Amino acid sequence: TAMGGSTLFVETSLRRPGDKDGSLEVTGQLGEVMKESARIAYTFARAFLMQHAPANDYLVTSHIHLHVPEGATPKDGPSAGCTIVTALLSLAMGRPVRQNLAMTGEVSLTGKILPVGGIKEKTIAAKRAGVTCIVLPAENKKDFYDLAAFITEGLEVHFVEHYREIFDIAF
Amino acid sequence: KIGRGYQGDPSSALLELLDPEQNANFLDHYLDVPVDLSKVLFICTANVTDTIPEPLRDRMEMINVSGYVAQEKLAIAERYLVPQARALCGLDESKAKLSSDVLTLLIKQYCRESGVRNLQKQVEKVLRKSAYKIVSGEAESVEVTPENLQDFVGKPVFTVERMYDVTPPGVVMGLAWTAMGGSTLFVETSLRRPKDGSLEVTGQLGEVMKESARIAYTFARAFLMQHAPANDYLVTSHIHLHVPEGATPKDGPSAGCTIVTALLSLAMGRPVRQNLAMTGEVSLTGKILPVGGIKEKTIAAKRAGVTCIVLPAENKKDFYDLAAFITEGLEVHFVEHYREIFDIAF
Amino acid sequence: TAMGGSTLFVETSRPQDKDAKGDKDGSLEVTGQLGEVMKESARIAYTFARAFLMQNDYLVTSHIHLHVPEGATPKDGPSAGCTIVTALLSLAMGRPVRQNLAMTGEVSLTGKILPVGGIKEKTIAAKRAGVTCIVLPAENKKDFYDLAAFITEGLEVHFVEHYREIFDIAF
């Protein structure tokens, strides 16, 4: 955020459970950039749950309605794509994520994870909150290791390439 | 409302004058000396801050002077408006008597605004027509009663009578929040056709209100089948729902409680108890989520002759910070589920 | 209308009665350049005529066209509710309304008649159109008696609150 690092909860819920497909109503962060990011994330979550556990029809017909809090610069906004995919997959499978876990990164239409900014601010925010595990784009590991040793000492960092690895370390 | 057009731009002069760090040396053009203006208490009135440049808004302590509710307006009228108008028109209490109840009626039906000038205009109108009746020799003492007010200030701008003083099956009174604030509406439900049943919805067509009414209807059907199982109305019947268009989009979906109550009242054939207005969005399980504009909703409840309103449980703090003249004669029920609202409608 | 009150004729008349199976729903096509509120009100009036005629199946098993002429200002849109209900009922029952009879007033889903505006203009137009009987909502009685003595001389008036009374005096 414009004030510095911050820690927000991306929340998906359910509302109104072969002819129709379940839509998605983003409410928190308005803007065309975050709108397209949410669309891409929704499509990838669907494809992931199709090729993995192909039986449940949840993510395809549910009318999810997620909500992403409003504090983030318009450039950092799309760095919630992997968080959105993980919230959607967690709500679908009915399994909460690993407890003390923070994640950031942009997700592609096929799941590739892209680098983001504000690594120091995000790290300090995660450390100020209670976080023991952090997940970061693999291309941000230089930026992570440039920080001071008293910041990045109490958290285990996972540098990911593709979202299958976040699904591994998140469930 | 300062000029910023072709000739000059005195906003920069004000930005130099109203700067606390440069007040100590003002330096107008005539005197080449600088004058200390740090002890002057400056006050600037504005109707809207949007047309104030940001470096100038940033130099002032923005204090918002909000309007008055009907009770504050009545106090103002009794203490200032009516005495000053008496003095300006040459009348007293014995010649023309404005009582507190006729003043309440005037404020309720005519002066439904945020400021005071219109109430003052109405007060002057009443006293002025009184003075004309006295001078022309028609009378020697005028009496303004809540029945005799009509021929003094004209047709009431707002109607006290509501659509239904006693509600039949299908229609339930819910109160909403408009851009003018404080509206009460009757959610109505009927049936169209004489094996699956359907819902046809009209009113404030909003994309989210569509899904809101849909899930409210679904929860109503499920609640009915679990509460009274031998009743198949809400499943085998085709019905029509109507929601009046007062509520702004934000609180458009805030009528789910009333919609479910209407559908259930129609399906059961039992009217809802009188003077009962309700608010609250329902979830699928029946969770009652918080609603906004409780001050306006409560004022509307009062104006519409309502006694017992129903609010979400987590609006308890939002409600119990409203003044006693706003919520004294109201009995409030706070609910965390729809079973409790069902009990509240007997 | 804008600067005036010219009286209008609503008319009714689509596929012919099938008379084969009573499982269909029947439909109402409405024209007359209606705003959104005007179309919703015409739909409410349709539903109320269908419910009022519970007694036969002309409203439920016939496809109908409704025409309300243009001219009523958008604020004065839904003031044709009782007129629409009467048009539908007369088409169904197969009998005309009283020959010189004009009406106005919004109708709710259950039959409650709501007050309207422009009583003076509507009355002037009714008198100039040869209308001898006029049906108004109840809450407009003071509004109607605040008129001059020549705006109403031989004009029979009926103030009403529920549409059953309009039906009684129209038939």
Side-chain angles (χ1 to χ4, degrees), chain B residues 150 163-164 188 193 200 202-203 240 242 245, chain C residues 23-25 37 40 43-44 47 109-110 112 142:
Chain B
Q150 195 81 308
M163 175 192 291
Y164 275 114
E188 307 158 355
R193 314 183 64 188
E200 174 178 312
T202 43
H240 187 158
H242 174 56
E245 317 156 88
Chain C
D23 60 356
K24 313 302 300 189
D25 195 13
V37 286
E40 310 278 289
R43 181 62 48 158
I44 293 159
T47 307
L109 198 64
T110 44
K112 190 71 186 49
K142 180 86 150 37

mmCIF file with all atom_site columns, all heavy atoms in Angstrom, chain B residues 150 163-164 188 193 200 202-203 240 242 245, chain C residues 23-25 37 40 43-44 47 109-110 112 142:
data_model
loop_
_atom_site.group_PDB
_atom_site.id
_atom_site.type_symbol
_atom_site.label_atom_id
_atom_site.label_alt_id
_atom_site.label_comp_id
_atom_site.label_asym_id
_atom_site.label_entity_id
_atom_site.label_seq_id
_atom_site.pdbx_PDB_ins_code
_atom_site.Cartn_x
_atom_site.Cartn_y
_atom_site.Cartn_z
_atom_site.occupancy
_atom_site.B_iso_or_equiv
_atom_site.pdbx_formal_charge
_atom_site.auth_seq_id
_atom_site.auth_comp_id
_atom_site.auth_asym_id
_atom_site.auth_atom_id
_atom_site.pdbx_PDB_model_num
ATOM 1   N N   . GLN B 1 150 ? -53.822 23.202  7.004   1.00 0.00 ? 150 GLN B N   1
ATOM 2   C CA  . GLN B 1 150 ? -53.810 22.991  5.562   1.00 0.00 ? 150 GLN B CA  1
ATOM 3   C C   . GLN B 1 150 ? -54.035 24.284  4.797   1.00 0.00 ? 150 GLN B C   1
ATOM 4   O O   . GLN B 1 150 ? -53.336 24.566  3.819   1.00 0.00 ? 150 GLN B O   1
ATOM 5   C CB  . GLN B 1 150 ? -54.873 21.962  5.186   1.00 0.00 ? 150 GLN B CB  1
ATOM 6   C CG  . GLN B 1 150 ? -54.717 21.395  3.801   1.00 0.00 ? 150 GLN B CG  1
ATOM 7   C CD  . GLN B 1 150 ? -53.681 20.306  3.747   1.00 0.00 ? 150 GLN B CD  1
ATOM 8   O OE1 . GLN B 1 150 ? -52.549 20.493  4.188   1.00 0.00 ? 150 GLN B OE1 1
ATOM 9   N NE2 . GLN B 1 150 ? -54.061 19.153  3.210   1.00 0.00 ? 150 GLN B NE2 1
ATOM 10  N N   . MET B 1 163 ? -49.538 3.179   2.509   1.00 0.00 ? 163 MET B N   1
ATOM 11  C CA  . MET B 1 163 ? -50.270 2.369   1.543   1.00 0.00 ? 163 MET B CA  1
ATOM 12  C C   . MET B 1 163 ? -51.222 1.405   2.236   1.00 0.00 ? 163 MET B C   1
ATOM 13  O O   . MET B 1 163 ? -52.301 1.104   1.717   1.00 0.00 ? 163 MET B O   1
ATOM 14  C CB  . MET B 1 163 ? -49.292 1.612   0.649   1.00 0.00 ? 163 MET B CB  1
ATOM 15  C CG  . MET B 1 163 ? -49.954 0.643   -0.309  1.00 0.00 ? 163 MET B CG  1
ATOM 16  S SD  . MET B 1 163 ? -48.778 -0.460  -1.101  1.00 0.00 ? 163 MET B SD  1
ATOM 17  C CE  . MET B 1 163 ? -47.902 0.690   -2.154  1.00 0.00 ? 163 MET B CE  1
ATOM 18  N N   . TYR B 1 164 ? -50.849 0.919   3.415   1.00 0.00 ? 164 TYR B N   1
ATOM 19  C CA  . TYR B 1 164 ? -51.643 -0.077  4.127   1.00 0.00 ? 164 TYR B CA  1
ATOM 20  C C   . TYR B 1 164 ? -51.515 0.179   5.619   1.00 0.00 ? 164 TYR B C   1
ATOM 21  O O   . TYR B 1 164 ? -50.430 0.015   6.181   1.00 0.00 ? 164 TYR B O   1
ATOM 22  C CB  . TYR B 1 164 ? -51.180 -1.490  3.785   1.00 0.00 ? 164 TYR B CB  1
ATOM 23  C CG  . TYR B 1 164 ? -51.787 -2.053  2.528   1.00 0.00 ? 164 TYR B CG  1
ATOM 24  C CD1 . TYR B 1 164 ? -51.003 -2.323  1.420   1.00 0.00 ? 164 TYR B CD1 1
ATOM 25  C CD2 . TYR B 1 164 ? -53.144 -2.330  2.453   1.00 0.00 ? 164 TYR B CD2 1
ATOM 26  C CE1 . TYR B 1 164 ? -51.552 -2.842  0.270   1.00 0.00 ? 164 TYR B CE1 1
ATOM 27  C CE2 . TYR B 1 164 ? -53.701 -2.851  1.307   1.00 0.00 ? 164 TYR B CE2 1
ATOM 28  C CZ  . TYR B 1 164 ? -52.899 -3.104  0.219   1.00 0.00 ? 164 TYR B CZ  1
ATOM 29  O OH  . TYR B 1 164 ? -53.449 -3.622  -0.924  1.00 0.00 ? 164 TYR B OH  1
ATOM 30  N N   . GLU B 1 188 ? -44.299 -6.455  -1.679  1.00 0.00 ? 188 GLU B N   1
ATOM 31  C CA  . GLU B 1 188 ? -45.570 -7.077  -2.014  1.00 0.00 ? 188 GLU B CA  1
ATOM 32  C C   . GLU B 1 188 ? -45.338 -8.384  -2.749  1.00 0.00 ? 188 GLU B C   1
ATOM 33  O O   . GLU B 1 188 ? -44.336 -8.555  -3.444  1.00 0.00 ? 188 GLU B O   1
ATOM 34  C CB  . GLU B 1 188 ? -46.436 -6.149  -2.868  1.00 0.00 ? 188 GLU B CB  1
ATOM 35  C CG  . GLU B 1 188 ? -46.630 -4.780  -2.267  1.00 0.00 ? 188 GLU B CG  1
ATOM 36  C CD  . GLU B 1 188 ? -47.005 -3.736  -3.294  1.00 0.00 ? 188 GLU B CD  1
ATOM 37  O OE1 . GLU B 1 188 ? -47.023 -4.055  -4.496  1.00 0.00 ? 188 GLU B OE1 1
ATOM 38  O OE2 . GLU B 1 188 ? -47.287 -2.589  -2.895  1.00 0.00 ? 188 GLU B OE2 1
ATOM 39  N N   . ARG B 1 193 ? -50.372 -17.352 -11.841 1.00 0.00 ? 193 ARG B N   1
ATOM 40  C CA  . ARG B 1 193 ? -51.120 -18.446 -12.423 1.00 0.00 ? 193 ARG B CA  1
ATOM 41  C C   . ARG B 1 193 ? -51.934 -19.173 -11.362 1.00 0.00 ? 193 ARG B C   1
ATOM 42  O O   . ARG B 1 193 ? -51.596 -19.135 -10.177 1.00 0.00 ? 193 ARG B O   1
ATOM 43  C CB  . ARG B 1 193 ? -50.170 -19.434 -13.100 1.00 0.00 ? 193 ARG B CB  1
ATOM 44  C CG  . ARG B 1 193 ? -49.120 -18.770 -13.957 1.00 0.00 ? 193 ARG B CG  1
ATOM 45  C CD  . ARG B 1 193 ? -48.262 -19.800 -14.650 1.00 0.00 ? 193 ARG B CD  1
ATOM 46  N NE  . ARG B 1 193 ? -49.032 -20.614 -15.582 1.00 0.00 ? 193 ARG B NE  1
ATOM 47  C CZ  . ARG B 1 193 ? -48.557 -21.689 -16.202 1.00 0.00 ? 193 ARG B CZ  1
ATOM 48  N NH1 . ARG B 1 193 ? -47.310 -22.079 -15.997 1.00 0.00 ? 193 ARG B NH1 1
ATOM 49  N NH2 . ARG B 1 193 ? -49.330 -22.369 -17.033 1.00 0.00 ? 193 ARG B NH2 1
ATOM 50  N N   . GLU B 1 200 ? -41.296 -14.209 -10.160 1.00 0.00 ? 200 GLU B N   1
ATOM 51  C CA  . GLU B 1 200 ? -41.155 -13.075 -11.062 1.00 0.00 ? 200 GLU B CA  1
ATOM 52  C C   . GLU B 1 200 ? -41.001 -11.825 -10.212 1.00 0.00 ? 200 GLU B C   1
ATOM 53  O O   . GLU B 1 200 ? -41.857 -11.536 -9.372  1.00 0.00 ? 200 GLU B O   1
ATOM 54  C CB  . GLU B 1 200 ? -42.363 -12.969 -11.991 1.00 0.00 ? 200 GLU B CB  1
ATOM 55  C CG  . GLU B 1 200 ? -42.375 -11.743 -12.876 1.00 0.00 ? 200 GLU B CG  1
ATOM 56  C CD  . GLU B 1 200 ? -43.575 -11.715 -13.798 1.00 0.00 ? 200 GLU B CD  1
ATOM 57  O OE1 . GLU B 1 200 ? -43.860 -12.747 -14.437 1.00 0.00 ? 200 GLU B OE1 1
ATOM 58  O OE2 . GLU B 1 200 ? -44.238 -10.666 -13.879 1.00 0.00 ? 200 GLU B OE2 1
ATOM 59  N N   . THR B 1 202 ? -40.099 -7.659  -9.753  1.00 0.00 ? 202 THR B N   1
ATOM 60  C CA  . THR B 1 202 ? -40.094 -6.326  -10.332 1.00 0.00 ? 202 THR B CA  1
ATOM 61  C C   . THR B 1 202 ? -39.695 -5.312  -9.271  1.00 0.00 ? 202 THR B C   1
ATOM 62  O O   . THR B 1 202 ? -39.807 -5.560  -8.069  1.00 0.00 ? 202 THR B O   1
ATOM 63  C CB  . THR B 1 202 ? -41.463 -5.950  -10.910 1.00 0.00 ? 202 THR B CB  1
ATOM 64  O OG1 . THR B 1 202 ? -42.491 -6.363  -10.004 1.00 0.00 ? 202 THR B OG1 1
ATOM 65  C CG2 . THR B 1 202 ? -41.676 -6.624  -12.244 1.00 0.00 ? 202 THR B CG2 1
ATOM 66  N N   . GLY B 1 203 ? -39.234 -4.155  -9.731  1.00 0.00 ? 203 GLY B N   1
ATOM 67  C CA  . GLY B 1 203 ? -38.873 -3.081  -8.829  1.00 0.00 ? 203 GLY B CA  1
ATOM 68  C C   . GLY B 1 203 ? -37.547 -2.443  -9.169  1.00 0.00 ? 203 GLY B C   1
ATOM 69  O O   . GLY B 1 203 ? -37.301 -2.075  -10.322 1.00 0.00 ? 203 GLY B O   1
ATOM 70  N N   . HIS B 1 240 ? -45.337 -13.698 -7.803  1.00 0.00 ? 240 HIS B N   1
ATOM 71  C CA  . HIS B 1 240 ? -44.775 -12.438 -8.261  1.00 0.00 ? 240 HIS B CA  1
ATOM 72  C C   . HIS B 1 240 ? -44.358 -11.635 -7.042  1.00 0.00 ? 240 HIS B C   1
ATOM 73  O O   . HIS B 1 240 ? -45.146 -11.468 -6.107  1.00 0.00 ? 240 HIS B O   1
ATOM 74  C CB  . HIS B 1 240 ? -45.793 -11.659 -9.103  1.00 0.00 ? 240 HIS B CB  1
ATOM 75  C CG  . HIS B 1 240 ? -45.242 -10.422 -9.747  1.00 0.00 ? 240 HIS B CG  1
ATOM 76  N ND1 . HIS B 1 240 ? -45.824 -9.843  -10.852 1.00 0.00 ? 240 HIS B ND1 1
ATOM 77  C CD2 . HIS B 1 240 ? -44.182 -9.642  -9.431  1.00 0.00 ? 240 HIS B CD2 1
ATOM 78  C CE1 . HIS B 1 240 ? -45.139 -8.768  -11.197 1.00 0.00 ? 240 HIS B CE1 1
ATOM 79  N NE2 . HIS B 1 240 ? -44.138 -8.623  -10.350 1.00 0.00 ? 240 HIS B NE2 1
ATOM 80  N N   . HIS B 1 242 ? -42.581 -7.939  -5.636  1.00 0.00 ? 242 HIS B N   1
ATOM 81  C CA  . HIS B 1 242 ? -42.382 -6.541  -5.988  1.00 0.00 ? 242 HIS B CA  1
ATOM 82  C C   . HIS B 1 242 ? -41.717 -5.816  -4.829  1.00 0.00 ? 242 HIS B C   1
ATOM 83  O O   . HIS B 1 242 ? -42.201 -5.873  -3.693  1.00 0.00 ? 242 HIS B O   1
ATOM 84  C CB  . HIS B 1 242 ? -43.710 -5.866  -6.343  1.00 0.00 ? 242 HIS B CB  1
ATOM 85  C CG  . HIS B 1 242 ? -43.588 -4.395  -6.573  1.00 0.00 ? 242 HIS B CG  1
ATOM 86  N ND1 . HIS B 1 242 ? -42.728 -3.859  -7.505  1.00 0.00 ? 242 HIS B ND1 1
ATOM 87  C CD2 . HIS B 1 242 ? -44.209 -3.347  -5.987  1.00 0.00 ? 242 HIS B CD2 1
ATOM 88  C CE1 . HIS B 1 242 ? -42.823 -2.542  -7.483  1.00 0.00 ? 242 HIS B CE1 1
ATOM 89  N NE2 . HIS B 1 242 ? -43.717 -2.206  -6.572  1.00 0.00 ? 242 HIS B NE2 1
ATOM 90  N N   . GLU B 1 245 ? -38.628 0.972   -5.033  1.00 0.00 ? 245 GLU B N   1
ATOM 91  C CA  . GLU B 1 245 ? -37.324 1.370   -5.547  1.00 0.00 ? 245 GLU B CA  1
ATOM 92  C C   . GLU B 1 245 ? -36.665 2.488   -4.749  1.00 0.00 ? 245 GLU B C   1
ATOM 93  O O   . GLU B 1 245 ? -35.992 3.340   -5.340  1.00 0.00 ? 245 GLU B O   1
ATOM 94  C CB  . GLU B 1 245 ? -37.457 1.797   -7.006  1.00 0.00 ? 245 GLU B CB  1
ATOM 95  C CG  . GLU B 1 245 ? -38.330 0.883   -7.825  1.00 0.00 ? 245 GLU B CG  1
ATOM 96  C CD  . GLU B 1 245 ? -38.905 1.576   -9.031  1.00 0.00 ? 245 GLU B CD  1
ATOM 97  O OE1 . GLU B 1 245 ? -38.238 1.575   -10.085 1.00 0.00 ? 245 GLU B OE1 1
ATOM 98  O OE2 . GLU B 1 245 ? -40.024 2.117   -8.926  1.00 0.00 ? 245 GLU B OE2 1
ATOM 99  N N   . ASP C 2 23  ? -51.909 -25.849 -20.164 1.00 0.00 ? 23  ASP C N   1
ATOM 100 C CA  . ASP C 2 23  ? -50.657 -25.877 -19.422 1.00 0.00 ? 23  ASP C CA  1
ATOM 101 C C   . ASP C 2 23  ? -49.773 -24.667 -19.695 1.00 0.00 ? 23  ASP C C   1
ATOM 102 O O   . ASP C 2 23  ? -48.786 -24.469 -18.978 1.00 0.00 ? 23  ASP C O   1
ATOM 103 C CB  . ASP C 2 23  ? -49.881 -27.157 -19.748 1.00 0.00 ? 23  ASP C CB  1
ATOM 104 C CG  . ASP C 2 23  ? -49.539 -27.275 -21.220 1.00 0.00 ? 23  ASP C CG  1
ATOM 105 O OD1 . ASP C 2 23  ? -49.971 -26.407 -22.003 1.00 0.00 ? 23  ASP C OD1 1
ATOM 106 O OD2 . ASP C 2 23  ? -48.835 -28.234 -21.598 1.00 0.00 ? 23  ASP C OD2 1
ATOM 107 N N   . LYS C 2 24  ? -50.095 -23.866 -20.705 1.00 0.00 ? 24  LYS C N   1
ATOM 108 C CA  . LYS C 2 24  ? -49.279 -22.724 -21.075 1.00 0.00 ? 24  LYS C CA  1
ATOM 109 C C   . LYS C 2 24  ? -49.539 -21.549 -20.137 1.00 0.00 ? 24  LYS C C   1
ATOM 110 O O   . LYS C 2 24  ? -50.387 -21.607 -19.245 1.00 0.00 ? 24  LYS C O   1
ATOM 111 C CB  . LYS C 2 24  ? -49.549 -22.328 -22.521 1.00 0.00 ? 24  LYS C CB  1
ATOM 112 C CG  . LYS C 2 24  ? -49.550 -23.498 -23.487 1.00 0.00 ? 24  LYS C CG  1
ATOM 113 C CD  . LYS C 2 24  ? -48.225 -24.240 -23.461 1.00 0.00 ? 24  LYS C CD  1
ATOM 114 C CE  . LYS C 2 24  ? -47.060 -23.341 -23.848 1.00 0.00 ? 24  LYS C CE  1
ATOM 115 N NZ  . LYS C 2 24  ? -45.805 -24.122 -24.035 1.00 0.00 ? 24  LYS C NZ  1
ATOM 116 N N   . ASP C 2 25  ? -48.792 -20.466 -20.349 1.00 0.00 ? 25  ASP C N   1
ATOM 117 C CA  . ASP C 2 25  ? -48.847 -19.317 -19.456 1.00 0.00 ? 25  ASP C CA  1
ATOM 118 C C   . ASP C 2 25  ? -49.498 -18.087 -20.071 1.00 0.00 ? 25  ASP C C   1
ATOM 119 O O   . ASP C 2 25  ? -50.036 -17.259 -19.333 1.00 0.00 ? 25  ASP C O   1
ATOM 120 C CB  . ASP C 2 25  ? -47.439 -18.945 -18.983 1.00 0.00 ? 25  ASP C CB  1
ATOM 121 C CG  . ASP C 2 25  ? -47.450 -18.012 -17.785 1.00 0.00 ? 25  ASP C CG  1
ATOM 122 O OD1 . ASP C 2 25  ? -48.519 -17.841 -17.167 1.00 0.00 ? 25  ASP C OD1 1
ATOM 123 O OD2 . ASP C 2 25  ? -46.384 -17.452 -17.454 1.00 0.00 ? 25  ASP C OD2 1
ATOM 124 N N   . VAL C 2 37  ? -39.576 2.130   -15.135 1.00 0.00 ? 37  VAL C N   1
ATOM 125 C CA  . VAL C 2 37  ? -40.616 2.130   -14.111 1.00 0.00 ? 37  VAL C CA  1
ATOM 126 C C   . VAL C 2 37  ? -41.982 1.894   -14.739 1.00 0.00 ? 37  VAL C C   1
ATOM 127 O O   . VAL C 2 37  ? -42.829 1.188   -14.175 1.00 0.00 ? 37  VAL C O   1
ATOM 128 C CB  . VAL C 2 37  ? -40.575 3.444   -13.312 1.00 0.00 ? 37  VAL C CB  1
ATOM 129 C CG1 . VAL C 2 37  ? -39.393 3.443   -12.369 1.00 0.00 ? 37  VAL C CG1 1
ATOM 130 C CG2 . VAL C 2 37  ? -40.494 4.635   -14.251 1.00 0.00 ? 37  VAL C CG2 1
ATOM 131 N N   . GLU C 2 40  ? -42.321 -1.824  -15.561 1.00 0.00 ? 40  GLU C N   1
ATOM 132 C CA  . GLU C 2 40  ? -42.550 -2.601  -14.345 1.00 0.00 ? 40  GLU C CA  1
ATOM 133 C C   . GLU C 2 40  ? -43.971 -2.410  -13.833 1.00 0.00 ? 40  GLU C C   1
ATOM 134 O O   . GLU C 2 40  ? -44.599 -3.356  -13.345 1.00 0.00 ? 40  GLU C O   1
ATOM 135 C CB  . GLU C 2 40  ? -41.546 -2.215  -13.260 1.00 0.00 ? 40  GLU C CB  1
ATOM 136 C CG  . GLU C 2 40  ? -40.097 -2.209  -13.701 1.00 0.00 ? 40  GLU C CG  1
ATOM 137 C CD  . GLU C 2 40  ? -39.461 -3.580  -13.683 1.00 0.00 ? 40  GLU C CD  1
ATOM 138 O OE1 . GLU C 2 40  ? -39.214 -4.108  -12.580 1.00 0.00 ? 40  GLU C OE1 1
ATOM 139 O OE2 . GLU C 2 40  ? -39.200 -4.125  -14.777 1.00 0.00 ? 40  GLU C OE2 1
ATOM 140 N N   . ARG C 2 43  ? -46.364 -4.364  -15.906 1.00 0.00 ? 43  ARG C N   1
ATOM 141 C CA  . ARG C 2 43  ? -46.280 -5.770  -15.520 1.00 0.00 ? 43  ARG C CA  1
ATOM 142 C C   . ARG C 2 43  ? -47.044 -6.035  -14.226 1.00 0.00 ? 43  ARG C C   1
ATOM 143 O O   . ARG C 2 43  ? -47.738 -7.055  -14.102 1.00 0.00 ? 43  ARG C O   1
ATOM 144 C CB  . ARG C 2 43  ? -44.815 -6.173  -15.387 1.00 0.00 ? 43  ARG C CB  1
ATOM 145 C CG  . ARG C 2 43  ? -44.585 -7.615  -15.010 1.00 0.00 ? 43  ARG C CG  1
ATOM 146 C CD  . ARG C 2 43  ? -45.126 -8.560  -16.058 1.00 0.00 ? 43  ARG C CD  1
ATOM 147 N NE  . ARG C 2 43  ? -44.724 -8.192  -17.409 1.00 0.00 ? 43  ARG C NE  1
ATOM 148 C CZ  . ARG C 2 43  ? -44.691 -9.046  -18.424 1.00 0.00 ? 43  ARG C CZ  1
ATOM 149 N NH1 . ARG C 2 43  ? -45.033 -10.310 -18.228 1.00 0.00 ? 43  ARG C NH1 1
ATOM 150 N NH2 . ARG C 2 43  ? -44.320 -8.642  -19.631 1.00 0.00 ? 43  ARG C NH2 1
ATOM 151 N N   . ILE C 2 44  ? -46.933 -5.128  -13.254 1.00 0.00 ? 44  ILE C N   1
ATOM 152 C CA  . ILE C 2 44  ? -47.692 -5.265  -12.010 1.00 0.00 ? 44  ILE C CA  1
ATOM 153 C C   . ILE C 2 44  ? -49.189 -5.235  -12.287 1.00 0.00 ? 44  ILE C C   1
ATOM 154 O O   . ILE C 2 44  ? -49.962 -5.998  -11.696 1.00 0.00 ? 44  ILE C O   1
ATOM 155 C CB  . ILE C 2 44  ? -47.289 -4.165  -11.012 1.00 0.00 ? 44  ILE C CB  1
ATOM 156 C CG1 . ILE C 2 44  ? -45.847 -4.357  -10.550 1.00 0.00 ? 44  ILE C CG1 1
ATOM 157 C CG2 . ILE C 2 44  ? -48.226 -4.155  -9.830  1.00 0.00 ? 44  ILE C CG2 1
ATOM 158 C CD1 . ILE C 2 44  ? -45.228 -3.104  -9.989  1.00 0.00 ? 44  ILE C CD1 1
ATOM 159 N N   . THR C 2 47  ? -50.256 -8.561  -13.728 1.00 0.00 ? 47  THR C N   1
ATOM 160 C CA  . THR C 2 47  ? -50.376 -9.570  -12.683 1.00 0.00 ? 47  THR C CA  1
ATOM 161 C C   . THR C 2 47  ? -51.629 -9.355  -11.846 1.00 0.00 ? 47  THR C C   1
ATOM 162 O O   . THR C 2 47  ? -52.316 -10.317 -11.481 1.00 0.00 ? 47  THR C O   1
ATOM 163 C CB  . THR C 2 47  ? -49.135 -9.551  -11.795 1.00 0.00 ? 47  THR C CB  1
ATOM 164 O OG1 . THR C 2 47  ? -47.964 -9.664  -12.612 1.00 0.00 ? 47  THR C OG1 1
ATOM 165 C CG2 . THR C 2 47  ? -49.168 -10.699 -10.805 1.00 0.00 ? 47  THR C CG2 1
ATOM 166 N N   . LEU C 2 109 ? -49.552 -4.095  -6.365  1.00 0.00 ? 109 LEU C N   1
ATOM 167 C CA  . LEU C 2 109 ? -49.691 -5.505  -6.714  1.00 0.00 ? 109 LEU C CA  1
ATOM 168 C C   . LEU C 2 109 ? -50.951 -6.120  -6.121  1.00 0.00 ? 109 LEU C C   1
ATOM 169 O O   . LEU C 2 109 ? -51.447 -7.128  -6.634  1.00 0.00 ? 109 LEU C O   1
ATOM 170 C CB  . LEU C 2 109 ? -48.457 -6.275  -6.248  1.00 0.00 ? 109 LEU C CB  1
ATOM 171 C CG  . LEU C 2 109 ? -48.165 -7.646  -6.845  1.00 0.00 ? 109 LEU C CG  1
ATOM 172 C CD1 . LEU C 2 109 ? -47.879 -7.543  -8.326  1.00 0.00 ? 109 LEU C CD1 1
ATOM 173 C CD2 . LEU C 2 109 ? -46.993 -8.264  -6.127  1.00 0.00 ? 109 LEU C CD2 1
ATOM 174 N N   . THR C 2 110 ? -51.487 -5.530  -5.057  1.00 0.00 ? 110 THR C N   1
ATOM 175 C CA  . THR C 2 110 ? -52.611 -6.110  -4.341  1.00 0.00 ? 110 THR C CA  1
ATOM 176 C C   . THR C 2 110 ? -53.921 -5.370  -4.567  1.00 0.00 ? 110 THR C C   1
ATOM 177 O O   . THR C 2 110 ? -54.967 -5.844  -4.116  1.00 0.00 ? 110 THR C O   1
ATOM 178 C CB  . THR C 2 110 ? -52.304 -6.167  -2.842  1.00 0.00 ? 110 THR C CB  1
ATOM 179 O OG1 . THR C 2 110 ? -51.715 -4.931  -2.425  1.00 0.00 ? 110 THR C OG1 1
ATOM 180 C CG2 . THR C 2 110 ? -51.333 -7.292  -2.550  1.00 0.00 ? 110 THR C CG2 1
ATOM 181 N N   . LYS C 2 112 ? -54.263 -1.707  -4.134  1.00 0.00 ? 112 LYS C N   1
ATOM 182 C CA  . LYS C 2 112 ? -54.317 -0.397  -3.506  1.00 0.00 ? 112 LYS C CA  1
ATOM 183 C C   . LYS C 2 112 ? -54.045 0.686   -4.540  1.00 0.00 ? 112 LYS C C   1
ATOM 184 O O   . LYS C 2 112 ? -53.104 0.579   -5.331  1.00 0.00 ? 112 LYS C O   1
ATOM 185 C CB  . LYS C 2 112 ? -53.303 -0.315  -2.367  1.00 0.00 ? 112 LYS C CB  1
ATOM 186 C CG  . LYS C 2 112 ? -53.444 0.916   -1.495  1.00 0.00 ? 112 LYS C CG  1
ATOM 187 C CD  . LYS C 2 112 ? -54.689 0.839   -0.640  1.00 0.00 ? 112 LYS C CD  1
ATOM 188 C CE  . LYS C 2 112 ? -54.897 2.126   0.127   1.00 0.00 ? 112 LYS C CE  1
ATOM 189 N NZ  . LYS C 2 112 ? -54.792 3.310   -0.762  1.00 0.00 ? 112 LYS C NZ  1
ATOM 190 N N   . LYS C 2 142 ? -59.166 16.073  -1.776  1.00 0.00 ? 142 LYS C N   1
ATOM 191 C CA  . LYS C 2 142 ? -58.876 17.464  -1.461  1.00 0.00 ? 142 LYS C CA  1
ATOM 192 C C   . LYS C 2 142 ? -58.251 18.172  -2.655  1.00 0.00 ? 142 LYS C C   1
ATOM 193 O O   . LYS C 2 142 ? -58.579 19.329  -2.947  1.00 0.00 ? 142 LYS C O   1
ATOM 194 C CB  . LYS C 2 142 ? -57.957 17.530  -0.244  1.00 0.00 ? 142 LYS C CB  1
ATOM 195 C CG  . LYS C 2 142 ? -57.574 18.929  0.182   1.00 0.00 ? 142 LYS C CG  1
ATOM 196 C CD  . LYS C 2 142 ? -58.609 19.533  1.109   1.00 0.00 ? 142 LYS C CD  1
ATOM 197 C CE  . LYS C 2 142 ? -57.962 20.515  2.062   1.00 0.00 ? 142 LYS C CE  1
ATOM 198 N NZ  . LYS C 2 142 ? -56.881 21.273  1.382   1.00 0.00 ? 142 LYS C NZ  1
#
